[PDB]
Amino acid sequence: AKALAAGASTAMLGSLLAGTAESPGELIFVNGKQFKSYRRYFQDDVLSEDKLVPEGIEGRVPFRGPLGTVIHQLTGGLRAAMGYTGSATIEQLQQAQFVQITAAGLKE
Amino acid sequence: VPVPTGGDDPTKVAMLGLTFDDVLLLPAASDVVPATADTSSQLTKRIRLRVPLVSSAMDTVTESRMAIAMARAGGMGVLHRNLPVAEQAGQVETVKRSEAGMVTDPVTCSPDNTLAEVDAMCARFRISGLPVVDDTGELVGIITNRDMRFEVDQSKPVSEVMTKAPLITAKEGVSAEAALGLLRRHKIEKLPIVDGHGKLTGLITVKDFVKTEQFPLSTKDSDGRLLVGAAVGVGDDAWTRAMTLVDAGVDVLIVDTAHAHNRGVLDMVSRLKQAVGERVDVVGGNVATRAAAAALVEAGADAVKVGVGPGSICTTRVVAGVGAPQITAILEAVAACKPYGVPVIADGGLQYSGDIAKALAAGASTAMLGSLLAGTAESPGELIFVNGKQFKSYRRYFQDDVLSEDKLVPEGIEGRVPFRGPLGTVIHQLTGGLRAAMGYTGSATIEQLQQAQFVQITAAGLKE
Amino acid sequence: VPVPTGGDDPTKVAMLGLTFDDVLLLPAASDVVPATADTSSQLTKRIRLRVPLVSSAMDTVTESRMAIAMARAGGMGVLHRNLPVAEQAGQVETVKRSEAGMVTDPVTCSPDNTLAEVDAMCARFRISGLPVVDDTGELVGIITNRDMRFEVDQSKPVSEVMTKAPLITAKEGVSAEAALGLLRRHKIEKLPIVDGHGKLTGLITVKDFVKTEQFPLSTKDSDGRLLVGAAVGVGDDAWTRAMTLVDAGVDVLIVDTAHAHNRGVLDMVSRLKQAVGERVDVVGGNVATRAAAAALVEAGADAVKVGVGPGSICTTRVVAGVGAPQITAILEAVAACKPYGVPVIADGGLQYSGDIAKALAAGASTAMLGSLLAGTAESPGELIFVNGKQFKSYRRYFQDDVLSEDKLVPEGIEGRVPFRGPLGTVIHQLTGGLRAAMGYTGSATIEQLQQAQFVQITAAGLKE
Amino acid sequence: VPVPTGGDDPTKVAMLGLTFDDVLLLPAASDVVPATADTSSQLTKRIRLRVPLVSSAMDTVTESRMAIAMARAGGMGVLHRNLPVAEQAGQVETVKRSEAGMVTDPVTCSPDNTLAEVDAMCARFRISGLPVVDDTGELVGIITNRDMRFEVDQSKPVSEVMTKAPLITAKEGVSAEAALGLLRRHKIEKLPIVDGHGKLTGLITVKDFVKTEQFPLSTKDSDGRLLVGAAVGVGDDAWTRAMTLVDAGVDVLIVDTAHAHNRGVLDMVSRLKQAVGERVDVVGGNVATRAAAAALVEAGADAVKVGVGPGSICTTRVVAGVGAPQITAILEAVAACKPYGVPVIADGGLQYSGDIAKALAAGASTAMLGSLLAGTAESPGELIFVNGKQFKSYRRYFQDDVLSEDKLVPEGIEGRVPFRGPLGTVIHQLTGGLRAAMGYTGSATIEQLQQAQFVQITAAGLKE
Numbered sequence A: 001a002k003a004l005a006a007g008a009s010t011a012m013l014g015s016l017l018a019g020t021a022e023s024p025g026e027l028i029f030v031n032g033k034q035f036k037s038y039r040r041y042f043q044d045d046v047l048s049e050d051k052l053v054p055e056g057i058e059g060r061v062p063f064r065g066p067l068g069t070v071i072h073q074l075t076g077g078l079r080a081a082m083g084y085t086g087s088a089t090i091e092q093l094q095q096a097q098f099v100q101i102t103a104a105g106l107k108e
Numbered sequence B, C, D: 001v002p003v004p005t006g007g008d009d010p011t012k013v014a015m016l017g018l019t020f021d022d023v024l025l026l027p028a029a030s031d032v033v034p035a036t037a038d039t040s041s042q043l044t045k046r047i048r049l050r051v052p053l054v055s056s057a058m059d060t061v062t063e064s065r066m067a068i069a070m071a072r073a074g075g076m077g078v079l080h081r082n083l084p085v086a087e088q089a090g091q092v093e094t095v096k097r098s099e100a101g102m103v104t105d106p107v108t109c110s111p112d113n114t115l116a117e118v119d120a121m122c123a124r125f126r127i128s129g130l131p132v133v134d135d136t137g138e139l140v141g142i143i144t145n146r147d148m149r150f151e152v153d154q155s156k157p158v159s160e161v162m163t164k165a166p167l168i169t170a171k172e173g174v175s176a177e178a179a180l181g182l183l184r185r186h187k188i189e190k191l192p193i194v195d196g197h198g199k200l201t202g203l204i205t206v207k208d209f210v211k212t213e214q215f216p217l218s219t220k221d222s223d224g225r226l227l228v229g230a231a232v233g234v235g236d237d238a239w240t241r242a243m244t245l246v247d248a249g250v251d252v253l254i255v256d257t258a259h260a261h262n263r264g265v266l267d268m269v270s271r272l273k274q275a276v277g278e279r280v281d282v283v284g285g286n287v288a289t290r291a292a293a294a295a296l297v298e299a300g301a302d303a304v305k306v307g308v309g310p311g312s313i314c315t316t317r318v319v320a321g322v323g324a325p326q327i328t329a330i331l332e333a334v335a336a337c338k339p340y341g342v343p344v345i346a347d348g349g350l351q352y353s354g355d356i357a358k359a360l361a362a363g364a365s366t367a368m369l370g371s372l373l374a375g376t377a378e379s380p381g382e383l384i385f386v387n388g389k390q391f392k393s394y395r396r397y398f399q400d401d402v403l404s405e406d407k408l409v410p411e412g413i414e415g416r417v418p419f420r421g422p423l424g425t426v427i428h429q430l431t432g433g434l435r436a437a438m439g440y441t442g443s444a445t446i447e448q449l450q451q452a453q454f455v456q457i458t459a460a461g462l463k464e
């Protein structure tokens, strides 16, 4: 909402979508949870520890679920901002004003 | 040519917002002793509180019990609206009936009644004694709990138990001094009041005088009844709710929205002021700018409540990106409201009594508290005992196993809130803080405190 | 003379209890390939599972969806009883109607019905197509979702939209191979089955063949329907519940209490075995000693569930001071039960698949899972998205404010349970662990795994 | 009658397993100086090491470089098998060619070869100098990197650069003392060796003498070449791999499985012992019980490797529930192996040098190291510099943006391993710890250390 109000027309998302079902990667199950990983021939031992864990356990990204739910949450936030600022369109949102806050305003 | 923060528009970044942590009150020349400071302040244009505090209209903060306690402590409570119209109006009725100079419509019984019937009525209305009338309406006795305490047959009629006429009575128009003298003389607690023909039209208790002596700061109307407010929304359901609340005897209506700079909110305020404005005060919901407060004043609000995402990491700021630091918001709203004599209510972002002093010094007349009161004894919720401590919980039929683990732990064990104790102690601490601020600034009254100056502090002043 | 731990009685401290962390399985001579190990096991004296796992009778674990998924995966589910009798029987009926060799009671409509009516019936039973019958009971056609997908007018009668007779049908006693040949030749998905006079008496669908191919480990009765269990308490309401569940077609009844070494529970087990034993297996509730297991065997139980406060800091141990370490409890219960051929179900205290392998090696035939299944997709609760993650929650009318913070966050955000994904993945991981244990111990079957030996480890063996 | 831990079988819980933290070595009467202690021990029945340590057959531990460093340090390396047969045989050959009493297959060139050609040959075999022979097969000179250093034309033939014959050479059978005398007289580093007809049959360098004097503990064969081991699995591909590794000149084959108590593994050991047992020692895979070790001994193994889930929270214990504490496993394996003179290798769970001492005192003859050696310079992987420290990592074409953030940071940043520096220092620390233990127990040799006594300690002994 702030980026659009500053005058941008769209936003490019990136890390907010890296763990979704539609993003590239492989879905794995580790320690009671779902993860995404960006992951053998000569390991013929049937009782070795590598057969007891999924491949790609290291460097795994958490799983976020369907993309539509993420997009719906983001759009709900944007619509709430548009309601607060009286912006019927994105072009009207681009005319909204800011208030600058201090360091105390970010202190929990 | 460019703005230092970017762009060509010098109003794009409208202002720098100050919050409570950005400022401190400066000491000034003072002859004020904290114990003698006057903390009374205007809630609305027609209502003045002894203690400049109001409890929030949240379903974890204010119901009848909290409203009664807040009114007795010198402030007022606003009942929440997350419940059916009938229940909210019933809570208003409970608050109004809690004490009075004279019960104008006492709960009467009939000689044919069983002891169970009168006992049910007493437990319903939370009272002790009932006058009795015949099927015509003539007073023929009174039954109190000392009579039933000594009667073991639960199924007896009232005529067997009631103290028969003639009772110790008094006529309509009797002065409070005369009624007190009669009660003192005859060593009784209750006094029927009758007209010239002997028809019952009132009841005076000594407990009312005792309460008046015990709670000298109480917020009351002309009849000696506690004041109370209630929240309403916008719409047709909201209009019917407002009318029902006005019927129940509400004193303040608060049109309660997250964003009051809206045509529907302003029209609702105007309609309420046209319809019930000669009896009830109407308060306009939350604003954060000078223009919105001016719109509320134009619409006819009796007070303006301030605050839109005033917390630092609040949900509104994180999700919508919308907010306003509370000190600047109060300064702007006061700039709009003070020329017309409309008080400002500071709502949200208050963590300590110092914050209350700062809010009043910025120009607000009262403060709405909220989370500070959430866990007290008078707030809604059930008290439970877990792991050596007390908590408040907002919490079976088919689970009949006598030895199952669920029977070993209290219900509501999850999501419980710490127990804070009685509300009076919290209010006392907050008032002590405010009086110390008034002593430091030399403010004999709240209106003088509203003229105090701030010093702005840097980041290094907040580092422990 | 004195006992080294105090007093004179050597039986005061009866024994030393071992939990799962105290032991490990020893490697043994093995010609067993984990992929080729046989994990089938006896649930009761008469029921054998392909996967020796059962979901727990908890309201956060097992309802219809969980029971269906567990039965397809090669195990079984036990429906919880924290709900009215009618709903529990409805869930039993839901599980039993999931799939079959032939639908012996198909949902039929009438030609005078509207498209909305048949749509609502289909949604009620989660089906796609209905045969249609007249006011006598002769089959006049069939209507499927390809018919209604291509008809817009929802007020059209079925007779206008339906596919009219003659239909591709077959007579009673048609083999599955012949019925499938018919379904394949005519390129249709459904096939009514009628009696010698043309009256509809069954329905065969290709989806049942597809499900049979897709879930080859399914736990099914002679008619091809998924097996399911249900829990009951003790008492007269429990007896009515049990009779209703037996009428609904349940396969296993579990008398489910915290302390089964009680005369009432034993009497309930005996009564159930006498009344409905020839149809339904009766499993007896939780024990932790040899004597209690022997008492349940004496009462006629078809299986014995083991575990009473098996967790380390479980509520029973802290509040009542009562418990029994699970390995020792299983060993004692098996010593009571194995001579009589009664299987033992290990219930409680399982954190990893290694614990499952240990529990079966101690003598148990199956394991009840519980918390391992709490957050799966098939468990009860709603899926929500919070802070970039998925959670499962167990979550307004008067909150009509569109901009309020309660609109900005999902419902149920307090005390949410982490989401785990589909049940099949969890079951597959657990079975991989069990197969690894069987390979290490050289156990070709679960019955051979029940003969494995342990090594007891010191506390130093638990230090990371 | 009942077993104190449950049930009726006194052998269900077979034993109590001790890990390294469960025991300490007791001091004994000693005339042993740690510096004069003798740490030599039998790896197999035919191979004796100066330092009783062997590097694990893991792809992050042992390749050619680690094997060379281990053999030079007094131990040995076992090449991992997670790679093609040709690469593993090439690594064997690289280890066997590192040094020798006499190079028996010298890398020769021809006068027609350009300088770039012979330079490429030197880079391929990591050498410095090449004899040169003509198309008939007669030695016509020698070209060394000093000759190539002073040449600016890279297209020149070898005949224009090489030192031409006659050369400083010697006949077959010349002793090392005479060869060193010749290399000292003529102040050269290389000496060709010809037969009775002037045909080149060897090459003696002075770097070999330098290496012998610099690494006086090197584990070497009768030809002065370093010893090396390699791991194989079970099956037909494993048999082909083993034959290829034997052709490359490997000294020990390790049949390397997670569970050697298996008919396939024992058959593989017997087949290898029959086929190549006269030349190569065969080591049998991991066991943890006395019966498994006895089976390996009967199968003909030259050594027995011990350890099956020896770590506290290892994946085998958590996922399969299978394990064996390592001290007890070593004691059982030694009870099986010692009467037949079969050495026991301790593999797994070692964290410090004190554990190495404990394992050798329990009866093992050598220890396999593994993760202690993973981050060393000779271990596989690439050295990177991140955040002011060094790391080892196991790490583009289409990212051609010169200013991208991926250019600013090294490849392999994620999942990196701490850098430990040279292997010699780590081995020196471990050997110092072992020598201290030998001094404390009065053990002049490893065989005397194998008779030392333990004290078992409690959990209070492990509290910091």
Ligand SMILES: Nc1nc2c(ncn2[C@@H]2O[C@H](COP(=O)(O)OP(=O)(O)OP(=O)(O)O)[C@@H](O)[C@H]2O)c(=O)[nH]1
Pocket: B097, B098, B099, B100, B103, B105, B106, B107, B126, B127, B128, B129, B130, B189, B190, B203, B205, B206, B207, B208, B211
């Ligand atoms: N009895 C009575 N009290 C009412 C009624 N409506 C409000 N009240 C208030 O209820 C309060 C308590 O009255 P009672 O319970 O009768 O008190 P009491 O018996 O006079 O006094 P204590 O014995 O000292 O508690 C008083 O403050 C009344 O003003 C009513 O209809 N009847």
Ligand SMILES: Nc1nc2c(ncn2[C@@H]2O[C@H](COP(=O)(O)OP(=O)(O)OP(=O)(O)O)[C@@H](O)[C@H]2O)c(=O)[nH]1
Pocket: C097, C098, C099, C100, C103, C105, C106, C107, C125, C126, C127, C128, C129, C130, C189, C190, C205, C206, C207, C208
């Ligand atoms: N149609 C139908 N199916 C039933 C009924 N009772 C249970 N079922 C089951 O419901 C499942 C799905 O049946 P339908 O919805 O008709 O599916 P379908 O059109 O045959 O098959 P697909 O197009 O492959 O989904 C089958 O496995 C039936 O055994 C019933 O009364 N009618």
Ligand SMILES: Nc1nc2c(ncn2[C@@H]2O[C@H](COP(=O)(O)OP(=O)(O)OP(=O)(O)O)[C@@H](O)[C@H]2O)c(=O)[nH]1
Pocket: D097, D098, D099, D100, D103, D105, D106, D107, D125, D126, D127, D128, D129, D130, D189, D190, D205, D206, D207, D208, D211
């Ligand atoms: N040149 C050569 N060296 C070999 C061969 N096979 C093994 N080596 C060994 O490679 C090592 C290095 O020898 P060179 O590269 O010739 O070294 P150098 O020039 O004699 O010695 P420095 O100048 O002191 O390094 C010696 O220890 C040889 O034993 C081979 O075919 N040719």
Ligand SMILES: Nc1ncnc2c1ncn2[C@@H]1O[C@H](COP(=O)(O)OP(=O)(O)OP(=O)(O)O)[C@@H](O)[C@H]1O
Pocket: B128, B129, B142, B143, B144, B145, B146, B147, B162, B163, B167, B168, B169, B187, B188, B189, B190, B191, B192
């Ligand atoms: N106005 C009255 N005239 C005469 N008798 C009365 C009157 N009011 C109450 N009484 C009677 O006098 C007695 C005292 O009752 P009172 O109402 O004073 O106390 P109570 O509230 O019942 O007692 P307690 O506060 O101790 O519980 C009772 O028997 C009651 O019936």
Ligand SMILES: Nc1ncnc2c1ncn2[C@@H]1O[C@H](COP(=O)(O)OP(=O)(O)OP(=O)(O)O)[C@@H](O)[C@H]1O
Pocket: C128, C129, C142, C143, C144, C145, C146, C147, C162, C163, C167, C168, C169, C187, C188, C189, C190, C191, C192
């Ligand atoms: N036994 C039958 N004999 C003749 N026609 C039939 C029979 N059963 C269904 N049909 C007709 O065959 C067509 C396809 O129906 P079917 O039930 O096979 O598919 P559907 O479930 O509607 O389709 P989809 O699964 O693709 O959504 C419809 O027109 C239906 O009326």
Ligand SMILES: Nc1ncnc2c1ncn2[C@@H]1O[C@H](COP(=O)(O)OP(=O)(O)OP(=O)(O)O)[C@@H](O)[C@H]1O
Pocket: D128, D129, D142, D143, D144, D145, D146, D147, D162, D163, D166, D167, D168, D169, D187, D188, D189, D190, D191, D192
């Ligand atoms: N056996 C030999 N007979 C005659 N000349 C030789 C012989 N061996 C080496 N040379 C020559 O002696 C010179 C020195 O070579 P040498 O092999 O001793 O050192 P290098 O390894 O080339 O040099 P450095 O190690 O100092 O870099 C070269 O010109 C080489 O051709």
Ligand SMILES: [Mg+2]
Pocket: B128, B145, B189
């Ligand atoms: Mg009283």
Ligand SMILES: [Mg+2]
Pocket: B189
């Ligand atoms: Mg009293």
Ligand SMILES: [Mg+2]
Pocket: C128, C145, C189
């Ligand atoms: Mg269909």
Ligand SMILES: [Mg+2]
Pocket: C189
């Ligand atoms: Mg289909």
Ligand SMILES: [Mg+2]
Pocket: D128, D189
């Ligand atoms: Mg050289």
Ligand SMILES: [Mg+2]
Pocket: D189
């Ligand atoms: Mg040199």
